[PDB]
Amino acid sequence: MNKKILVVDDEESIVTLLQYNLERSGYDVITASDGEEALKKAETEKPDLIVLDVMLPKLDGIEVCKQLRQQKLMFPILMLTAKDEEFDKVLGLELGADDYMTKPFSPREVNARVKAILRRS
Template identity: 55%
Template sequence: MKKVLVVDDEPAISTLLTYNLQQHGFETLAAPDGETALELVQNNLIDCILLDLMLPGMDGLTVLKRLLQIKSSVPVIIITAKSQEVDRIIGLELGADDYISKPFSPREVVARVNAVLRRNSKPQTVGQNVLKIDSLTLDLDRHLVQIHDHEINLTPKEFELLVYFVENRTHVLSRQQLLQHVWQVDYELDSRMVDIQVSHLRDKLREYAPEQKWIKTVRGFGYQFGLESK
């Protein structure tokens, strides 16, 4: 049974979330603040975290940073009010996997939890499985990326995105295609999440090969992996 941690200081919302998750077969833990959440993550095997950004004491973005430092492989879905667009974008930039805006439906929450769990439970390929293009090497078994023998530190989502770009390097990929194949979502999701992740990926690749234009923007359509020199 998958275990979901709900971090929200409003008892009514916390109860609503935990009840609906339990009704769909999840085990749940609840934390009213960031300190309690960090303690629960350290002492329990958590599969997914629902994190409200408006928390007493330690703010939600700080909690997110700490959570990702402790358990970077655990997917985090941030919960924000529609007026918190800046915080939502910062949360995605810090490494959150998804977001939900208030007011939300319990059905939407369950769908998004299931989606991030599917994305993080892909079976690992056994055996030698390496992609190499020019100075870029991707070891799919070890989730290792190197440029000119320098290891690049990517988040799990950035790694998935890069692999998909490389495997489809002859195609221009729309944001919707990236959402469907990398995020594996079956609901409407803000395409800015794609833009943010692509921007982060570009920055990390550019650090070790600044002369290379790794991912091209195709105006009006999306992106394409490329090996053009600037």
């Protein structure tokens, strides 16, 4: 069976892009548009990987990771950052992030990053 990816971004266009391309690549995809929804879906649907926007409404990406860590939950996490919004990757490691991708990104870039992370496990 297909691996399941939870895609989380508040920009609808980014979610649509990610879902289309990852489904084409043979993954099952579920989505969230805010951090509260994301945390609930992670806890319940147990995705194999989470693609998570850093700047998110309700609970931001840092907070989502922090709450997962507090629950002792470990997910492969690809963090998405905006142009010229540098992220502290040492903090990211504290939070359980596994990799980072900046926006904009191409279909092949995201496919490559997700594949590499899924292989590392």
